[PDB]
RNA sequence: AGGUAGUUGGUGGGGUAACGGCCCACCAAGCCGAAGAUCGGUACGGGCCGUGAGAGCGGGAGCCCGGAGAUGGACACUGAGACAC
RNA sequence: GCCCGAGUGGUGGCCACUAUUAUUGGGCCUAAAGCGGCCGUAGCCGGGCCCGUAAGUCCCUGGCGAAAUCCCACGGCUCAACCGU
RNA sequence: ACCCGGGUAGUCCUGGCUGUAAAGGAUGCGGGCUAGGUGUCGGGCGAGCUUCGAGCUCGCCCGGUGCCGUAGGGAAGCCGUUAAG
RNA sequence: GAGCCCGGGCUCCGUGAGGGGGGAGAAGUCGUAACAAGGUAACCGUAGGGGAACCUACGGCUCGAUCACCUCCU
RNA sequence: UGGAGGUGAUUUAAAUGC
């Protein structure tokens, strides 16, 4: 359940709906759902938060269950709805949010350098990126010619 | 909980009927965020801990 | 004890290391 | 080699058994006892290992080790590799030349017997023998006798008298 | 993480056993465990099980008769020839009687005794007795 | 995990582990190098002849006092000074200075002089190629030169 | 703990019974290394052997099998064959 | 008086005992022994479900790992060692 | 020397080096499984109270932090859902 | 194309004044360090000083002290 | 009933013995 990583503390036990086919007391068409998604990605919100607002407002807990089957290759869900349109960021949001944050740290340290702890999370966030990079290369969202560095983090954000 | 005897969240669904426009919205008993009415611009619920605290009197049918 | 020994070892080392340095 | 001595040689319980055995069969040295223990050990060891393995391995191996024990006579008409392990150092010692000479009534007593075969006063088959160890088969039992001997070339050797006063065979 | 999910099933199942609960719950679930419980049931060691496949995971609720003493996976999971069986026979099992050294095989999965009757072998998976 | 990697391909780690940890047996290390064979003269051997430089008597150990009979002998090819413990009561007598004296060890080659004697690693068997236990008994042979 | 300069490879050639950097002319800059190379120690290698319930550990003796040597070190003839107890 | 017996004992070496080298089959709070803590490279180790290959893996056949030594049988030498089949 | 009266380095700040400890819980990390009780910290939930603020309390749950203790382990002390099972 | 030689460098074997330590011998001397709060608790890393055991400073730890005084916990 | 801290602490009691 847990993983105490850079911690000793058991992780949240947040858990999914054990629903495997979707509510029908809730009702939306493949067309209506697709609109809602596109509207929200147009705002500047991102896929986790897109799935969040749809849940809280339109009452759809996860997209996969509602959508698929409509092309049963795999489950149809937010960003796989986005890529077919061309609205997808070529960097996975995972890797993006990560790097995004990271560049902010550096600026703090820039002005403030006497910071143990703040220094120590720079080291703790990079090394999650590294990993997240490493595997993607092999999966293929990021070319094999790339390698990660703090000038090649300040170029991707700008 | 019931993690080895099938974990099911605490959740449910409830039909909320707006008091300012009569607009019928489906709402997750736990609002994580501010849910906005789609034909008033109002706030139905506000996100605090556990179950979103419902702002004032808004009608409710419990599913 | 280990006080003893540490300084004895240190003195041995120094004095001898003095004799090597010289 | 051809001997064994258990991990601890001076142990009382091991030594008692022997000395009682030593008079019983009238050995000359302990080594002799040992010969039969160590011989017994090998049959057991093998009998056991064969029964254990997968039943498809050429059964000939079993047959062969049951054949010899039958022929030698230790095993009578029993069919299990488990009876073999039910032998003891006494049974082997019953099978010797020495033992079998006293038994049939060719000798007064086993101590006497030790004299006879050495000087060639016991014939087996057509041959004489010098080694009282000699393993005597079942088929081989019927062919112990006198012919060119000091016990039987006449009927007035006191030798004949010495064997007659007793007349008792049996386990030695 | 986990690895050897089977093993973490089995090990519960036994420590489950040793207490003398009534039935078990194994949160991670699978073919390996599924299949193994299947073969286990086939020999009879266990009573009945239901797995419920939740969108999360398979879970096995298992009924405990009382039979099982000890049943464990193999660590590097060694390959074992059908000639070497007897060695691995004497070691792991408690005696000639029991015969569920559960191996994995060309034919499928079997115990030790069901393996020997066919005549086929391979890498070890787990044990049961 | 109780130490060891267990895994099909790992073995090499195993294979080096053992060997790494073997060298904590002094005895094993010592032989596999050959420190037993280099140090405590002999060049390893069962025994060694040597010329009796003199006769010396030394003291006994801690609960003890008694004059042990010891020789000083020089091994001839070894060319090393060895002080040595002589078996028997009278003995020191039958050994003339500058007779040949063959020498052995006594009671584990480890270094261990027997409990009484401090130093003495070794034993003497012989005076002019006839031994000491033969010279404790009067009849058997008696010494020359 | 870094080593390597006929050194790794390429082209063409010599020599040899013959392939081959074996040797050599020209061209290239490789080749090998922490899955431990290089260097240092020690040591003929194998069949076996000793021991040990087994797993294992130690060992290369007669004998057989294969290689190396003949006071140390180099060198050719003569012969199918030797660089020749 | 006990042992063993043409042997018996001394020194030395190796193996066993020694799960005191832990694969089988060891530990590591206080007995020896956790790195003061983290990161991630090399390595080892890996949730479920379907399909291909069959590299490992198992099964069968086939080429082959000299003789000797070993183990078992029978046969030979008075017996066995030893040798022959 | 313990006790008392003076006293430099240092103790403070900034930049750098140095890298040690009974740096302890003398207890490497990760996952799963295995009676319980109680106190406590923070988060959730159903109520009663209310000063209308989770302020005062009851119980289930999640994360952490102590103590006591069943089965088991341990040589024993002890450990025992914060394992040394 | 060997052995052979020559000049230098590097390494190894036989052997040497002198020099270091160990396990000891326990009848000389100095002291009381630790083990009892050892009579100033003890250890610990670091630094200085003392003939010695050792003392002191600073930080840590209890494998820490004996009541007393105060505080919590089944 | 058994466990953990925080600080008074007591100098009126002397070194050694194979």
CA proximity to A24, closest of A54, A65, A55, A53: A65
CA triple D4-D8-D11, angle to 5 deg? 110
Residue B45's Cβ-count burial label (10 Å; 0-12, 13-18, 19+) is buried
Separation of alpha carbons F69 and F93, rounded Å: 10
C-alpha separations of A103 from A91, A96, A116, A124, E73 in Å: 16, 11, 18, 13, 48
Beta bridge partners of D32: none
Confirm if F47 and F75 have CB atoms less than 8 A apart: no
Helices and strands counted in chain E (H then E): 4, 7
Residue F136: DSSP 8-state = H
Confirm if D114 and D98 have CB atoms less than 8 A apart: yes
Confirm if A71 and A30 have CB atoms less than 8 A apart: no
Q: What are residue F48's phi and psi, to 5 degrees?
A: -155, 130
Token reading at A22: 């979707």
C-alpha separations of D52 from A123, E5, E90 in Å: 63, 35, 10
Beta bridge partners of B16: B25, B60
Separation of alpha carbons E102 and D140, rounded Å: 53
> In the E/F pair of chains, how many CB contacts fall below 8 A?
5
Sheet of D127-128, strands arranged across? D127-128, D123-124, D144-145
B28 vs A13, A16, A56: nearest CB: A56
Separation of alpha carbons A61 and A71, rounded Å: 20
Confirm if B44 and B51 have CB atoms less than 8 A apart: no
Helices and strands counted in chain B (H then E): 0, 6
CA proximity to F95, closest of F41, F135, F47, F36: F135
Between the CA of F47 and the C1' of H15, what is the distance in angstroms?
A: 23
Separation of alpha carbons B60 and F78, rounded Å: 109
CA proximity to D24, closest of D94, D121, D107: D94
Separation of alpha carbons E12 and E6, rounded Å: 10
CA proximity to F99, closest of F60, F58, F52, F59: F52
Residue D145's Cβ-count burial label (10 Å; 0-12, 13-18, 19+) is middle
Contacts of range A52-57, beta carbons closer than 8 Å, 24 or more positions apart: A52/B32, A52/B33, A53/B33, A55/B28, A55/B32, A56/B27, A56/B28, A56/B31, A56/B32, A56/B33, A56/B35, A57/B25, A57/B27, A57/B35, A57/B36, A57/B38
Q: How far is E44 from chain A (nearest CA, A)?
A: 32
Q: Which nucleotide is nearest to A4 (CA to C1')?
A: I30
Question: Closest residue to H60 by CA to C1' distance?
Answer: E120
Question: Closest residue to I34 by CA to C1' distance?
Answer: E15
CA proximity to E104, closest of E49, E36, E45: E36
Contacts of range D119-124, beta carbons closer than 8 Å, 24 or more positions apart: D119/D150, D120/D149, D121/D146, D121/D149, D121/D150, D121/D151, D121/D159, D122/D97, D122/D146, D123/D147, D123/D148, D123/D149, D124/D97
Confirm if D132 and D96 have CB atoms less than 8 A apart: yes
> How many Cα atoms occupy the beta-carbon half-sphere of D101 within 13 Å?
30
Dmax over CA atoms of chain F, in Å, equals: 74
User: According to DSSP H, which parts of F23-140 are helical?
Assistant: 26-33, 35-38, 133-136
Which approach determined this entry? cryo-EM
Token reading at E93: 């099992």
All chains having 3 or more CB pairs closer than 8 angstroms to chain C: none
CA proximity to E125, closest of E78, E92, E60, E91: E78
C-alpha separations of A136 from A18, A143, A144, A147, A148 in Å: 30, 9, 9, 12, 13
Q: Confirm whether any atom of chain I, the nucleic acid strand, is less than 7 Å from CB of A1.
A: yes
Set of chain B residues whose Cβ sits within 8 Å of the Cβ of A59: 13, 25-28
Strand H nucleotides with an atom less than 7 Å from a protein beta carbon: 2-6, 10-14, 20-28, 38-41, 43-50, 56-60, 71-74, 78-80
| Kind of pairing between the strands at B24-28 and B35-36 | unpaired
Confirm if D123 and D104 have CB atoms less than 8 A apart: no
Token reading at D111: 């101590």
Residue B58: DSSP 8-state = -
CB neighbours of A141 closer than 8 A, spacing ≥ 6? A90, A91, A92, A95
Separation of alpha carbons A38 and A45, rounded Å: 11
Q: Do B28 and A52 touch (CB under 8 A)?
A: no
Separation of alpha carbons F83 and F65, rounded Å: 19
Separation of alpha carbons B38 and B23, rounded Å: 8
Beta bridge partners of B28: B13
Confirm if E102 and E39 have CB atoms less than 8 A apart: yes
**Residues for chain C: how many in total?**
22
Separation of alpha carbons F99 and F132, rounded Å: 13
- How far from chain centre, in Å, is Cα A154? 20
Sequential DSSP letters for D33-95: HHHHHHHHHHHHHHHHHHHHS-TTS-THHHHHHHHHHHHHTSS-S---HHHHHT--HHHHHHT
E64 CB neighbour count, 10 Å cutoff: 18
**Residues for chain A: how many in total?**
158
Confirm if F50 and F125 have CB atoms less than 8 A apart: no
Token reading at D144: 């112990």
Separation of alpha carbons B57 and E8, rounded Å: 52
A144 CB neighbour count, 10 Å cutoff: 8
CA dihedral D69, D70, D72, D73 (to 10 degrees): 110
Q: Return the residue matching tokens 């299949």.
A: E35
Separation of alpha carbons D81 and D55, rounded Å: 13
The structure was resolved to a resolution in Å of 5.3
- How far from chain centre, in Å, is Cα D17? 18
Separation of alpha carbons F87 and F68, rounded Å: 9
Q: What are residue E63's phi and psi, to 5 degrees?
A: -95, 135
Beta bridge partners of E123: E79
Q: Return the residue matching tokens 């069901």.
A: E114
Between the CA of A119 and the C1' of G3, what is the distance in angstroms?
A: 42
Q: Which nucleotide is nearest to C16 (CA to C1')?
A: J20
Separation of alpha carbons D135 and D95, rounded Å: 6
Q: If DSSP codes are grouped into helix, strand and coil, which group holds residue D23?
A: helix
Token reading at D78: 């029993």
Beta bridge partners of B46: B53
Question: Which H/E stretch holds residue B60?
Answer: strand B59-62
Confirm if E80 and E122 have CB atoms less than 8 A apart: yes
Token reading at F91: 């003995």
- CB contact A19 to E (< 8 Å): yes
CA proximity to F82, closest of F109, F111, F120: F120
Set of chain A residues whose Cβ sits within 8 Å of the Cβ of B6: 18
Confirm if F53 and F74 have CB atoms less than 8 A apart: yes
- How far from chain centre, in Å, is Cα D64? 20
C-alpha separations of D74 from A156, D46, D48 in Å: 93, 16, 17
Separation of alpha carbons F99 and F53, rounded Å: 9
Q: What are residue A119's phi and psi, to 5 degrees?
A: -55, -40
CA proximity to E56, closest of E38, E29, E32, E35: E29
Sequential DSSP letters for F93-138: GT--TTSEEEEEE-S-TTS---SS-SS--EEE-EETTEESHHHHST
C-alpha separations of A149 from A102, A126, A130, A140, F128 in Å: 11, 9, 9, 19, 87
Report chain D's C-alpha Rg in angstroms: 19
* Helices A30-43 and A78-85, packing angle to 10 deg: 80
Q: What are residue B53's phi and psi, to 5 degrees?
A: -65, 115
Separation of alpha carbons A53 and A47, rounded Å: 10
C-alpha separations of F98 from A41, A92, B14, F17, F76 in Å: 110, 96, 117, 54, 12
Token reading at D126: 């057509």
Separation of alpha carbons E60 and E52, rounded Å: 7
Instruction: Mark out chain E residues that contact chain B at CB-CB < 8 A.
Output: 25-27, 52, 54, 56, 59, 61
List chain F domain ranges: 1-145
């Amino acid at each position: 359940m847990a993983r105490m990583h850079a911690r000793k503390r058991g992780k949240s036990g947040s858990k999914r709906p054990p629903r495997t086919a979707p509510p029908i007391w809730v009702e939306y068409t493949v067309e209506e759902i697709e609109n809602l998604v596109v509207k929200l990605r147009k705002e500047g919100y991102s896929t986790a938060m897109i799935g969040t607002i749809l849940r809280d407002q339109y009452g759809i807990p996860s997209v996969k269950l509602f959508k698929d089957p409509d092309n049963p290759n795999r489950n149809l869900t937010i960003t796989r709805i986005l890529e077919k349109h061309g609205l997808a960021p070529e960097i996975p949001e995972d890797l993006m949010f990560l790097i995004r944050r990271a560049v902010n740290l550096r600026k703090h340290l820039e002005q403030h350098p006497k910071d143990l702890h703040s220094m120590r999370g720079l080291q703790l966030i990079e090394s999650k990126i590294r990993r997240l990079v490493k595997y993607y290369k092999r999966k293929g969202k990021l070319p094999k010619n790339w390698r990660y560095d703090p000038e090649t983090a300040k170029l991707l954000v700008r | 909980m019931a993690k080895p005897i099938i974990p099911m969240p605490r959740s449910r669904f409830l039909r909320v009927k707006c008091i300012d426009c009569g607009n019928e919205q489906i709402v997750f008993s736990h609002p994580a965020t501010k849910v906005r009415c789609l034909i008033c611009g109002a706030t139905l619920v506000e996100p605090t801990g556990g179950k979103g605290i419902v702002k004032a009197k808004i009608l409710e049918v419990l599913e | 004890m280990r006080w003893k020994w540490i300084k004895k070892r240190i003195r041995r080392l120094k004095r001898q290391r003095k004799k090597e340095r010289g | 080699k051809k001997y064994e001595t258990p991990p601890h040689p001076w142990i009382k319980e091991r030594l008692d058994r022997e000395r009682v055995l030593m008079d019983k069969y009238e050995l000359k040295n302990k080594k002799e006892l040992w010969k039969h223990e160590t011989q017994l050990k090998n049959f057991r060891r093998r009998a056991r290992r064969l029964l254990a393995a997968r039943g498809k391995q050429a059964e000939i191996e079993r047959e062969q080790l049951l054949a010899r024990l039958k022929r030698l006579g230790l095993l009578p008409e029993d069919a299990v590799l488990d009876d073999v392990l039910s032998l003891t150092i006494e049974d082997i010692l019953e099978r010797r030349l020495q033992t079998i000479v006293y038994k049939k009534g060719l000798a007064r007593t086993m101590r006497q017997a030790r004299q006879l075969i050495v000087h060639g006063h016991i014939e087996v088959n057509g041959q004489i023998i010098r080694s009282p160890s000699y393993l005597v088969l079942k088929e081989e039992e019927d062919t112990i006798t006198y012919a060119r001997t000091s016990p039987f070339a006449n009927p007035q050797h006191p030798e004949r008298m010495m064997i007659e006063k007793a007349k008792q065979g049996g386990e030695a | 993480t986990l690895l050897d999910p089977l093993a973490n099933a089995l090990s519960h199942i036994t420590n489950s056993e040793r207490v003398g609960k009534r039935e078990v719950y194994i949160k991670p679930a699978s073919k390996l465990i599924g299949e193994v419980l299947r073969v286990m049931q086939k020999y009879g060691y266990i009573g009945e099980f239901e797995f419920i496949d939740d969108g999360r995971a398979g879970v096995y609720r298992v009924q405990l008769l009382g039979r099982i003493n000890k049943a464990g996976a193999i660590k590097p999971r060694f390959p074992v020839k059908v000639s070497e069986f007897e060695k691995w026979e004497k070691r792991f099992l408690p005696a000639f009687e029991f015969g569920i050294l559960i191996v994995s095989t060309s034919q499928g999965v079997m115990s030790h005794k069901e393996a020997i009757e066919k005549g086929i072998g391979g890498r070890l998976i787990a044990y049961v007795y | 995990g109780k130490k060891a990697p267990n895994g099909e391909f790992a073995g090499r780690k195993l294979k080096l582990k053992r060997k790494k940890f073997r060298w904590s047996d002094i005895r094993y290390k010592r032989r596999v190098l050959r420190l037993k064979e280099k140090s405590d003269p002999l060049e390893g051997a069962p025994q060694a002849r040597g010329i009796v430089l003199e006769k010396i008597a030394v003291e006994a150990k801690q609960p003890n006092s008694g004059m042990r009979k010891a020789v000083r002998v020089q091994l001839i090819k070894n060319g090393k000074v060895v002080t040595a413990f002589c078996p028997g009561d009278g003995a020191i007598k039958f050994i003339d200075e500058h007779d040949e004296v063959i020498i052995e060890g006594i009671g584990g080659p480890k270094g261990g002089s027997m409990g009484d004697i401090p130093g003495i690693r070794y034993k003497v068997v012989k005076v002019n190629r006839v031994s000491l236990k033969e010279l404790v008994k009067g009849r058997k042979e008696k010494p020359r030169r």
